[PDB]
Amino acid sequence: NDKKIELLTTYLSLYIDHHTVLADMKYVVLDVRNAIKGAIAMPAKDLATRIGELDPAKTYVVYDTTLGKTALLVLLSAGFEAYELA
Template sequence: METTKIDFLKTYLSLYIDHQTVMADAQQANPQYVILDVRNAPAKIKKDQIEGAIAMPAKDLANRLSELDQHKTYVVYDWTAGTTLGKVALLTLLSADFKAYELSCALEGWKGMHLPIESL
């Protein structure tokens, strides 16, 4: 039974990427990661986003896959780690054969670490 739990946790954790990895990649000349803000709210409600993120609401993602580069790796985020939009977006991307992760701790964690954001 413990092996089953361990395997499940390994799989679960493999779906996430940490802030430091994303930040380090952003400093590269040709970043591997593209950050997608998948929150389904208008800009006036969002007010800010991770610096350089592309707004692509989870509800629209399946219809906008043709806009994405199959050679990049996508990092999706939602408001908080406890919400499901990031997971829905991740499922959409992975099901369409994109490389993708969900940002660990979502926007809330990013802001809590005082990492770069931009006003909308």
């Protein structure tokens, strides 16, 4: 039953534990909702067009579904290192 394990392993590696961002509050949070402190507002429907103003050196964390995922997918496809806030 390597499928479940493989699926869960990859599903989980998409999230950043609240306890991990905990040690940083390196990380740049990104609220991608539809208009938490230290959160640079930036809806997913715009994240693409505004992907230039993002510093690849910092790891991105997005929180809200599908909104988070899409935004997460944009970042990871672009090559950035990103996670979704658990």
